[PDB]
Symmetry: C2
């Protein structure tokens, strides 16, 4: 549960007023943003930030393994934070929003299933996709 | 029971001109244990039909990709691995020691997932569950 700027500072990255704005925009993003969204939001905060600065800062965060790049066939990219703690997710498809949840009850069933098949469960990923009732 | 549709049959259905060499490559792709790269597809295909060239394997793979039968995963260094697109969906248990995918279904887990969805005000329309296992100690 550390901020993006903290992670950056810890991993040997030079920080500044503009790079911290970018980090916050990127931390606060509802979506998985591209560089165009990151720039548009950052210039609302600091009108002096250039598109070159946004791009440069994003690349450095990627270098540090704080964010992961997802490339599309056409060469455009979207970014996600690389999580320290991994949770099950319930996706609100209508709003494109993620809801964190935990279910020790399901986890115990998963352990039983794994065991019946010859395995000790060491990790899991569960995503649920929902529409309003 | 229905006759399962093979990768080469799907390729044909999607307008791809199949040749014996392309069928060999289709079968190698469908039967691959891992998510293969072009190198592995070539090494395995040439053991079936010694006349198959690397150029042919590459060309054929791109055509399967064009047909939406396989999807490509690119790495930072430009290398790629491929996976078939599933009509089989399921939940999966991964044997980490071997890379084996074990399919399973759990009505009990499904009931709890629906309940979690419901309690957050949602109807569940889909789910993805991956379990990661090591051999029992």
């Amino acid at each position: 549960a550390k901020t993006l700027e903290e992670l950056a500072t810890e991993r040997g990255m030079r920080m500044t007023e503009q790079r911290r704005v970018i980090a916050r925009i990127l931390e606060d993003s509802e979506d998985h943003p591209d560089v165009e969204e990151l720039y548009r939001r950052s210039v609302k905060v600091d009108a002096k930030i250039s598109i070159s600065t946004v791009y440069r800062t994003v690349k450095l965060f990627e270098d540090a393994g704080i964010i992961a790049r997802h490339d599309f066939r056409d060469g455009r990219s979207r970014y996600e934070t690389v999580p320290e703690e991994h949770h099950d997710h319930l996706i609100d498809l209508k709003t494109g929003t993620v809801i964190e949840f935990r279910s020790p009850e399901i986890e115990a069933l998963q352990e039983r299933i794994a065991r019946e098949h010859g395995f000790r469960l060491v990790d899991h990923r569960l995503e649920l996709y929902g529409v309003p009732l």
